Write an enzyme that holds these catalytic residues in place. Structure first.
Site, PDB file in Angstrom:
ATOM      1  N   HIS C 139       0.794  -1.206   0.000  1.00  0.00           N
ATOM      2  CA  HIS C 139       0.000   0.000   0.000  1.00  0.00           C
ATOM      3  C   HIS C 139       0.840   1.275   0.000  1.00  0.00           C
ATOM      4  CE1 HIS C 139      -2.519  -3.275   1.759  1.00  0.00           C
ATOM      5  NE2 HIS C 139      -3.312  -2.884   0.777  1.00  0.00           N
TER       6      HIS C 139
HETATM    7  C1  LIG Z   1     -11.730 -16.781   5.963  1.00  0.00           C
HETATM    8  C2  LIG Z   1     -12.540 -15.866   5.059  1.00  0.00           C
HETATM    9  C3  LIG Z   1     -12.170 -14.548   5.043  1.00  0.00           C
HETATM   10  C4  LIG Z   1     -10.988 -14.167   5.939  1.00  0.00           C
HETATM   11  C5  LIG Z   1     -12.882 -13.645   4.247  1.00  0.00           C
HETATM   12  C6  LIG Z   1     -12.553 -12.293   4.195  1.00  0.00           C
HETATM   13  C7  LIG Z   1     -13.274 -11.412   3.391  1.00  0.00           C
HETATM   14  C8  LIG Z   1     -12.932 -10.061   3.366  1.00  0.00           C
HETATM   15  C9  LIG Z   1     -13.588  -9.150   2.544  1.00  0.00           C
HETATM   16  O1  LIG Z   1     -14.816  -9.629   1.879  1.00  0.00           O
HETATM   17  C10 LIG Z   1     -15.858  -9.631   2.869  1.00  0.00           C
HETATM   18  C11 LIG Z   1     -12.564  -8.827   1.455  1.00  0.00           C
HETATM   19  C12 LIG Z   1     -12.417 -10.033   0.550  1.00  0.00           C
HETATM   20  C13 LIG Z   1     -12.964  -7.538   0.681  1.00  0.00           C
HETATM   21  O2  LIG Z   1     -12.889  -6.353   1.532  1.00  0.00           O
HETATM   22  C14 LIG Z   1     -14.250  -6.062   1.903  1.00  0.00           C
HETATM   23  C15 LIG Z   1     -12.157  -7.077  -0.547  1.00  0.00           C
HETATM   24  C16 LIG Z   1     -12.955  -5.935  -1.165  1.00  0.00           C
HETATM   25  C17 LIG Z   1     -10.673  -6.738  -0.161  1.00  0.00           C
HETATM   26  C18 LIG Z   1      -9.890  -6.153  -1.327  1.00  0.00           C
HETATM   27  C19 LIG Z   1      -8.339  -6.203  -1.226  1.00  0.00           C
HETATM   28  O3  LIG Z   1      -7.803  -7.196  -1.968  1.00  0.00           O
HETATM   29  C20 LIG Z   1      -6.479  -7.324  -2.080  1.00  0.00           C
HETATM   30  C21 LIG Z   1      -6.060  -8.323  -2.936  1.00  0.00           C
HETATM   31  O4  LIG Z   1      -6.978  -9.103  -3.582  1.00  0.00           O
HETATM   32  C22 LIG Z   1      -4.711  -8.478  -3.178  1.00  0.00           C
HETATM   33  O5  LIG Z   1      -4.323  -9.467  -4.046  1.00  0.00           O
HETATM   34  C23 LIG Z   1      -2.878  -9.761  -4.232  1.00  0.00           C
HETATM   35  C24 LIG Z   1      -3.806  -7.648  -2.537  1.00  0.00           C
HETATM   36  C25 LIG Z   1      -4.195  -6.631  -1.659  1.00  0.00           C
HETATM   37  O6  LIG Z   1      -3.216  -5.823  -1.037  1.00  0.00           O
HETATM   38  C26 LIG Z   1      -1.897  -5.837  -1.684  1.00  0.00           C
HETATM   39  C27 LIG Z   1      -5.577  -6.493  -1.425  1.00  0.00           C
HETATM   40  C28 LIG Z   1      -6.078  -5.515  -0.583  1.00  0.00           C
HETATM   41  O7  LIG Z   1      -5.300  -4.790   0.040  1.00  0.00           O
HETATM   42  C29 LIG Z   1      -7.468  -5.356  -0.506  1.00  0.00           C
HETATM   43  C30 LIG Z   1      -8.001  -4.239   0.378  1.00  0.00           C
HETATM   44  S1  FES Z   2       1.833  -1.163   2.950  1.00  0.00           S
HETATM   45 FE1  FES Z   2      -0.001  -2.347   3.169  1.00  0.00          FE
HETATM   46  S2  FES Z   2       1.135  -4.083   3.740  1.00  0.00           S
HETATM   47 FE2  FES Z   2       2.983  -2.958   3.431  1.00  0.00          FE
END
Ligand SMILES: C/C=C(C)/C=C/C=C/[C@H](OC)[C@@H](C)[C@@H](OC)[C@@H](C)CCc1oc2c(O)c(OC)cc(OC)c2c(=O)c1C
Ligand code: FES
Ligand code: HEC
Ligand code: HEC
Ligand code: HEM
Ligand code: HEM
Ligand code: HEM
Ligand code: HEM
Ligand SMILES: C/C=C(C)/C=C/C=C/[C@H](OC)[C@@H](C)[C@@H](OC)[C@@H](C)CCc1oc2c(O)c(OC)cc(OC)c2c(=O)c1C
Ligand code: FES
Lengths: 206, 428, 174, 428, 206, 174
Positions: C139
């Site tokens: 980030h």
């Molecule tokens: C055990 C089950 C679990 C833990 C479920 C968790 C679900 C969480 C949320 O859904 C409800 C979540 C998926 C959702 O946030 C609302 C997405 C919009 C998040 C988007 C998201 O993606 C990334 C990503 O794909 C990446 O790829 C390599 C890399 C990333 O940073 C480098 C990110 C990232 O920084 C973020 C904010």
């Molecule tokens: S800046 Fe988001 S993980 Fe290093």
């Protein structure tokens, strides 16, 4: 932005080029780079170098493998994958490179072809990390003789093994373009008939 | 409910069957629900989604037959699927782009809703079930994305499990619990695999509850003017049976969508993803260009927008005595972004339903829309200003819109003149 | 109607015990709980170079800093920092000055968990970033020459692990 | 249907909710359905089945979080579940014994129904959906069993995938198809794992339809005499609301069942299984004592009873010109054994419902009941006569009962005297 | 049909016997038999032999393993499993024997204790798959010196390793019994309250 | 309403092609169709002994028969046999006599795919069963000394594979 038989929707590999490229691979790249995900037998398949069985068998035979079930080496056989290569001074496996780097085979070709001479043990490269790759420029001219005349110029060689690498990445490219062609054509026909049907269902109401 | 004509058995079998399981009555009241006759092409994204749900599951069950969820075999197993399984590559590419069609379609679907007042009384429950499905889709999609155990799977997995560790107090424990240890590793791979299989079934259940809800209220329409319930002759003037009329409008539209879908699947199977997941998870290196899946890009954008530099972040860091820092704020802002969208029926106080008849709305709504694409866009650009500014503007607009703009228009705005009945609209 | 409480209460309990087994099987299992020490031999690492070793699912950075980096590090005032803490497990309540960041009383050895304190990415080194420290591509967090967080979402300086020198040419982790 | 009384919204919330998703009406109807007041303990096995389905699935999803479907790692992965996973051993023994409890419950449930005419008009459909679920349970259970990849798992997989290769003409193909190649190997493990996860969901669905159908006809009762539909006052005389009266009676029965169940899980976890599954599959050796899972034994007894020596076997073998030999006959007899039971609503032509009131019937039914236990027990004895003879007799009794005895009785038997109504029955 | 502290609902292992059995294992059986599913660290858990850390570590030390990620040997650490043994003349893994054979530990005992002298390279045994085993009687007296002074009679040793092997098969026997105890008692109590509730509910109706 | 048919028709087709895709992925995949020859070393096999070797996910039985088994196997009349086919790949068309069953004229080398022709369990040998050949513990099939099926559910004599001797000591399977 060089080009290849295969970019575009009617593209296809060029068999010969693919063999040229396999050969560049065998004789140059495979010392530092493996192809774990490529089974040797696929060298035989429609849509690739398509060598014939006995050649694929002969080719497979130049590679060594520690038999899991045993514990002695044996020469390789078509059911085995190319070797996995690694340790010190050894490059990333290349089975997926063309897809991993969309400009794939261009990047491989750009890189092979992008050494100037500098050496800050790094080496300046037009296309890499920007711009110091740790891979000494690997190709020089007539470093390979093609049974097929083609002048083994560095550019040529980089190109052939790029095509060849593209195929280790997408072996089913031809199948996938072909099926795609029929699906799209088929859906276009279908779209059309649902269109009319739908229109006929609706003229009475409009 | 809308006067409609209900199922009547004639056949011997249908009489027999009706007395014991009136399953044909159920089918009939579903395929024959009276639909507003004036629906436009926006109303088709529901059937496209249903299609995607059935497509992700079908291809999924079948991919599981050749996939191994072990860190030493996951990536090889996807490679073996691509190379050796009959039609492997094709199913693999269907399931992958499949996910993308899915999100393409929800966003459109959703935005239709936000424009036409499909969340306003009496359709709040439909909407909230819609939002559950939405959360679930995102969770589902993330886990699947871990499955190939590429570089994106792994750092993607680290990062999203990281979101929970941000919660003050209990975050390290939720994090350890999701991980299954101190780091993303085989236990992680192995539980996300289960849940990836389970969640799409929960989603199907919610979708049943979804359809049920809109059948209870009746479909909405571009005018926001409810089907007349005064008699059957009136309601018939405003509506048509879902079958054959919209099943076929729908199937046709789907067909056109699938025409592009398969084009992509056949010729650009990988343009909508990140090459870099063709490299094997490496726990020592995070790759220099690490961009989330596109459908996640806006929420991601909202996330990094909130660095220590940002004033709202320092004010809140300060007021909160350090408990809410840029790390927690950015997460809150991201789930907040989603939640305030959830709450829209209680924020949009305008009593007029459809945006068509709202003239100050049309503007703020497109801005919203642009906002969403622009956010997707920045998420794919480096931090390094001027993008952070563009990201911050974007977010502030997003909350501004649900938290301020929509309640304002409650008071400010003046409906242009609506048609009086659906049948009215249709004749024009 | 005391019967009613014991019975409902008993149900509760049965439900909670069931729910807990289901929840608790996801907590680290017994094999995953051995977090042993280790010894990285640093005899190899030259200057302006970083070695990266796997330890505990995570990378460790061991950097041998150049003259300037040690300087760069030493300038910088406690007050110019986001995290005034030296996040150091063997100088356990120290401020974030350079001297409490390195193993050697001398500035040269920088040992750190190579994990971004934001959301766990691995920051790129060789002075990438606006402070020629590390930049974390996930980030946009920039860490300075002594591993302290200068710009972005990351709330803390890259931590320092329990660690010392055994031989002159060796380091023990944890 | 039975005169009942419908749900009534009061709360602010309920009025709101009811206009938009009448889910609370649906719950209420399910839980307040008028139930015949004179149900006996034979009626509690449906709730034990429901419990078991929910238990298998819950433990199932969670086991999958630590299981690996690969031939080099399956059996090790179960070991790591037993030893390293919190509550692991317990979840494992729960899921395996649960299968046994599941099967006890169906056999019981099934026989309750076979005795009390719960399959007779108008309940045919409830029954067919019963039979389907039954078939799904067996498939499901066969595949889970393969998962540990022990000796029983592996030669199980061989024998059962072999049933299909017996089909004339196409059996070699269906067999290659199920195997994923020329022998029970990793592909086989890998696809069964998928189906094992999937099928229990199809079972839950069928169960939804199952409950739907008996809600439609109303429950049966020990007497075979329907609830009275003539008015509210007298339907009340025959019934009580499922909630609270039977809910709490079942919950109690369930607890008593669960006392035993946990006793077994706790103190004799392996007593219902075959020790041999603790040895790792070996493709070169089938163990000398290879006994099927107990709930499979009757069907297995039927199968092997049919050798070349058997005269109906040489008869059919001759007539069909070699196309039906012992191998194929045996397979037809075992699936046949199941099918005729499916067909019993059309075979049992006695107009009387409850077996309670049929004197000839009781005897034949109870012989069936013994047959079934005796087949089970012979399934565990080796070929070497006198067992084959017992198995041969048993088979014959099985078909005689459904094909010959039941139809004749329709013609010959004399109902004892039935109560006029359930309220009457209840009073004694 | 010997007996063990562990059979029955209130049976627990005997920690010392388990130590005696592990010693018998280490000194006699491990030449020919592995325990691949037993990780060395569990030699330290409640419910087992329960050596102290230092000793488990010191014990693990006598074993070698080819480091997967290295390729160098190294003494074993507690997180490794016991060695896997196999080849010509080697026996089935023992980790699960006592459950794979319900009279499991009896069988192990009955078999170690049932050699009559004869030979064929088979060896008559009272208890084997009737009755010729390919395993030369492994035990003879004082073949082991217990640090705790138990007569190292064959019978003793057969009995101790039999217990030990019961534990390697069910290392969690005691958690299971104990959870067993708490669930049955809990359910009996639950069953009772539900019964009284059901009664209070159905009295007015009956 | 020729429209109707083309639409129903193509609907059907897309459905067929969709179902075939889902069905066909389960047919043996490419890496599994390499059924290669192999070669056993049979110099170790003493008389009255069986060697079991995996070939094609399955057991192959190679037994060197005693002279009694050869005699035993030679007595029987084609008529007492359930399966009169020699089930021999190297003699695809012959009777089930003993001499049609082994690899050699002397009747010493009985080579068979070791899989009960009933439903695939591996029949046990060393003279097991009522006919001193093999017994299959899964549904009680007994095979005689020439591996011919004598009693039980199995419809066929254990098969005879493609095979022959290269050198004295080496059998070539497939
Ligand atoms: C055990 C089950 C679990 C833990 C479920 C968790 C679900 C969480 C949320 O859904 C409800 C979540 C998926 C959702 O946030 C609302 C997405 C919009 C998040 C988007 C998201 O993606 C990334 C990503 O794909 C990446 O790829 C390599 C890399 C990333 O940073 C480098 C990110 C990232 O920084 C973020 C904010
Ligand atoms: S800046 Fe988001 S993980 Fe290093
Ligand atoms: C040893 C002398 C090598 C030979 C011969 C070849 N390669 Fe190589 N390669 C080598 C190294 C040490 C590396 C890593 C470079 C680094 O410092 O990161 C590589 C890398 C590549 C790459 C891409 C690396 C990347 O994009 O991250 C490619 C595409 C590549 N190598 C291709 C390639 C080809 C086609 C070769 C045959 C002509 C070849 N290399 C030979 C070491 C060596
Ligand atoms: C080599 C000198 C051995 C030593 C020392 C021990 N065992 Fe063994 N064992 C060995 C072989 C070759 C076999 C196979 C026997 C057969 O023909 O099947 C065995 C077998 C066993 C078994 C039971 C196997 C079964 O199929 O039931 C057991 C329980 C067993 N061995 C136990 C055992 C114990 C406890 C030992 C320590 C005293 C021991 N064996 C030593 C070879 C050798
Ligand atoms: C799995 C994803 C989904 C599926 C399969 C699905 C299905 C459908 C279908 C078939 C319709 C009716 C026709 C139409 O307008 O397209 C519909 C309508 C609707 N959906 Fe969805 N939907 C999904 C997700 C969502 C989401 C995420 C939301 C909002 C967050 C949502 C909100 C609505 C609303 C408000 C309606 C209007 C109901 C009405 O007009 O009365 N849906 N959905
Ligand atoms: C809402 C439905 C689903 C969504 C949104 C979804 C999403 C995804 C995504 C994004 C991936 C990674 C794609 C890639 O390889 O690049 C994936 C992979 C995978 N999914 Fe799903 N999925 C869905 C349904 C299912 C179901 C029901 C199954 C059940 C088997 C399943 C099984 C798999 C498997 C085995 C993989 C790994 C192979 C692969 O990467 O293609 N999916 N999923
Ligand atoms: C009708 C419900 C089910 C039945 C009748 C059933 C049956 C079985 C049986 C008999 C076994 C072998 C038990 C053993 O000896 O270990 C098994 C294993 C297994 N089952 Fe199920 N099962 C059901 C539901 C499920 C579901 C929904 C899942 C989804 C996660 C699941 C996952 C597993 C796994 C991973 C194994 C291998 C681990 C083990 O052997 O315990 N099961 N199943
Ligand atoms: C997944 C397995 C099953 C579940 C969860 C289940 C559940 C239930 C429940 C809760 C009831 C009502 C109370 C009772 O009579 O016990 C019921 C009734 C019934 N079931 Fe099942 N059942 C299952 C399997 C079967 C099978 C295999 C059959 C027949 C082959 C069957 C046939 C019937 C019949 C005839 C009734 C009586 C309907 C009536 O009273 O009118 N069920 N089932
Ligand atoms: C891909 C999914 C598939 C292919 C599902 C197939 C389902 C088939 C049938 O259910 C519908 C089948 C399971 C069911 O037949 C009605 C059972 C009663 C069959 C009983 C059965 O068990 C055995 C077993 O367990 C064994 O263990 C070691 C060994 C066996 O022989 C040695 C058998 C066996 O000889 C039989 C007949
Ligand atoms: S499989 Fe050998 S007898 Fe049934």
């Amino acid at each position: 932005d060089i080009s290849f038989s295969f970019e575009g929707p009617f593209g296809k590999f060029d068999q010969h080029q693919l063999q040229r490229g396999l050969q560049v691979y065998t004789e140059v790249c495979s010392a530092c780079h493996g192809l774990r995900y490529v089974p040797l037998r696929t060298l035989a398949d429609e849509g690739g170098p398509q060598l014939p069985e006995d050649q694929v068998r002969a080719y497979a035979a130049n590679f060594d493998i520690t038999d899991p079930e045993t514990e002695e080496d044996r020469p390789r056989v078509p059911t085995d994958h190319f070797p996995t290569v690694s340790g010190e001074g050894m490059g990333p496996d290349l089975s997926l490179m063309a897809k991993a780097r969309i400009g794939g085979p261009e990047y491989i070709h750009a890189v092979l072809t992008g050494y100037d001479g500098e050496e800050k043990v790094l080496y300046h490269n037009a296309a890499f990390a920007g711009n110091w790759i740790q891979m000494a420029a690997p190709l020089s001219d007539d470093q390979v003789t093609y049974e097929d005349g083609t002048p083994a110029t560095v550019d040529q060689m980089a190109t052939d093994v790029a095509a060849f690498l593209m195929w280790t990445a997408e072996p089913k490219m031809m199948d996938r373009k072909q099926v795609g062609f029929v699906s799209v054509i088929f859906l276009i026909v279908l779209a059309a008939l649902l269109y009319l049907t739908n229109k006929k269902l609706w003229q009475p109401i409009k | 409910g809308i006067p409609h004509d209900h199922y009547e058995p004639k056949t011997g079998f249908e009489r027999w069957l009706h007395r014991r399981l009136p399953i044909v009555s159920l089918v009939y009241d579903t395929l024959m629900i009276p639909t507003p006759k004036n629906l436009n092409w926006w109303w088709i994204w529901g059937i496209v989604l249903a299609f995607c749900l059935v497509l992700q599951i079908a291809t999924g069950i079948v991919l599981v037959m050749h996939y191994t969820p072990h860190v030493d075999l996951a990536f090889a197993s996807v490679e073996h699927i691509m190379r050796d399984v009959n039609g492997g590559y094709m199913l693999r590419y269907l399931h992958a782009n499949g996910a993308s069609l899915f999100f393409l379609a929800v966003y459109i679907h959703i935005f239709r809703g936000l424009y036409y007042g499909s969340y306003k009384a009496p359709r709040e429950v439909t909407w909230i079930v819609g939002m559950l499905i939405y959360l679930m889709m995102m969770g589902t999609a993330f886990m699947g994305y871990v499955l190939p155990w590429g570089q994106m799977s792994f750092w993607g997995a680290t990062v999203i499990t990281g979101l929970f560790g941000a919660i003050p107090g209990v975050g390290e424990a939720i994090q350890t619990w999701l991980l299954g240890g101190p780091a993303v590793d085989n236990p992680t791979l192995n539980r996300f695999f289960s849940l990836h299989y389970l969640l799409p079934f929960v989603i199907a259940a919610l979708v049943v509850v979804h359809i049920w809800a809109f059948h209870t209220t009746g479909n909405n329409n571009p005018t926001g003017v409810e089907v007349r319930r005064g008699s059957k002759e009136e309601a018939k003037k405003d509506t048509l049976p879902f079958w054959p009329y919209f099943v076929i409008k729908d199937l046709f539209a789907l067909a056109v969508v699938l025409v592009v879908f398969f084009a992509i699947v056949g010729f650009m199977p990988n343009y909508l993803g990140h090459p870099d997941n063709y490299i094997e998870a490496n726990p020592l290196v995070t790759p220099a260009h690490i961009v989330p899946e596109w459908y996640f890009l806006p929420f991601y954008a909202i996330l990094r927008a909130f660095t220590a530099d940002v004033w709202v972040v320092m004010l809140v860091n300060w007021l909160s005595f350090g408990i809410i820092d840029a790390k927690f704020f950015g997460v809150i802002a991201m789930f907040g972004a989603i939640l305030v969208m959830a709450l829209v029926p209680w924020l949009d106080t305008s009593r007029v339903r459809s945006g068509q008849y709202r003239p100050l709305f049309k503007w703020w709504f497109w801005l919203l829309a642009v906002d969403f694409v622009v956010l997707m866009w920045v998420g794919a650009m480096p931090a390094e200003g001027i993008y952070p500014y563009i990201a911050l503007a974007g977010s502030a607009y997003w909350f501004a819109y649900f938290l301020i703009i929509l309640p304002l228009l409650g008071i400010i705005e003046k409906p242009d003149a609506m048609p009086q009945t659906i049948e009215e609209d249709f004749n024009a | 109607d005391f019967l009613y409480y014991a019975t409902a209460g008993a149900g509760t309990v049965a439900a909670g015990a069931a729910a807990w087994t289901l929840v608790n099987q996801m907590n680290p299992s017994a094999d995953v709980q051995a977090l042993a020490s280790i010894q990285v031999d640093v005899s190899g690492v030259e200057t302006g170079t970083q070695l990266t070793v796997k330890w505990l699912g995570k990378p460790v950075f061991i950097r041998r800093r150049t003259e300037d980096e040690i300087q760069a590090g030493r300038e910088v005032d406690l007050g110019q920092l986001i995290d005034r803490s030296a996040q150091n497990s063997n100088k356990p309540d120290a401020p974030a000055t350079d001297e409490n960041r390195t193993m050697d009383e001398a500035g040269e050895w920088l040992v750190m968990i190579g994990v971004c304190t934001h959301l766990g990415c691995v920051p790129i080194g060789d002075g990438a970033g606006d402070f020629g420290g590390w930049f974390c591509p996930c980030h946009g967090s920039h860490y300075d020459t002594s591993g302290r967080i200068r710009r972005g979402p990351a709330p803390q300086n890259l931590h320092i692990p329990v660690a010392e020198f055994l031989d002159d040419t060796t380091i023990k982790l944890g």
